[PDB]
Amino acid sequence: LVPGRHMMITMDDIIREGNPTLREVAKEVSLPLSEEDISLGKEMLEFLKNSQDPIKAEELHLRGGVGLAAPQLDISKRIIAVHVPSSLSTVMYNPKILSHSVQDACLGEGEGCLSVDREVPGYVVRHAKITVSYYDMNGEKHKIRLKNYESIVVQHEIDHINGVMFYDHINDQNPFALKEGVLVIE
Ligand SMILES: [Fe+3]
Ligand code: NA
Ligand code: NA
């Protein structure tokens, strides 16, 4: 009567700051995608969506997030997923930024990260606009231009597959330093 099966990412699966895995440069995924890499991708997206629904997030004790990277699950593979409420909801395999605007931006409230628990003061300067290239679960290759929030989320996730944490962009002694005309989103 009941079809197939799958797993569900639980908060315990998300490793925390200090875990060395978060600092490695994730490995490139092989194509065509394995049924294992496709599943992980799906498990990652289900999570983000789940963490964003009050009832599910609550019943499943999840912390809301809009982006996630395989390394955070302790899987060093270049795979990320983003789910931005109404607009952008996909899994990206071997994502790579091909170009960016000169214009910079940042989240006025500061970026979040399921992997860090401490509160980190400051602004993280990002490219207002970017063009990302990657592969979906089908094997289809995509090239898309993103801006503002979505651009920030993706840049934040790709940093993860390169062993980079958001607070690495924050000048510890001048946390809120910003150049002129930087678009602060909030
Ligand atoms: Fe993060
Ligand atoms: Na898992
Ligand atoms: Na973020």
UniProtKB/TrEMBL annotation:
Residues engaged in binding Fe cation: C113, H156, H160
Catalytic activity: N-terminal N-formyl-L-methionyl-[peptide] + H2O = N-terminal L-methionyl-[peptide] + formate
Highest taxon, organism lineage: Bacteria
Cofactor entry: Fe(2+)
Enzyme class: hydrolase
Cofactor binding note of this UniProt entry: Binds 1 Fe(2+) ion.
Keywords of this entry: Hydrolase, Iron, Metal-binding, Protein biosynthesis
Any one Pfam family match given in the protein's UniProt record, by short name: Pep_deformylase
GO BP, sorted A to Z: translation
Active site (catalytic residues): E157
Residues reported in the UniProt entry to bind Fe(3+): C113, H156, H160
SUPFAM superfamilies: Peptide deformylase
InterPro entries named in the record: Peptide_deformylase, Peptide_deformylase_sf
E.C. number(s) listed in UniProt: 3.5.1.88
An annotated Gene Ontology molecular function: peptide deformylase activity
Functional summary from the UniProt entry: Removes the formyl group from the N-terminal Met of newly synthesized proteins. Requires at least a dipeptide for an efficient rate of reaction. N-terminal L-methionine is a prerequisite for activity but the enzyme has broad specificity at other positions.
HAMAP family the UniProt entry points to: Pep_deformylase
Protein family per UniProt: Belongs to the polypeptide deformylase family.
Record's protein name: Peptide deformylase
Organism classification: Bacteria, Bacillati, Bacillota, Bacilli, Lactobacillales
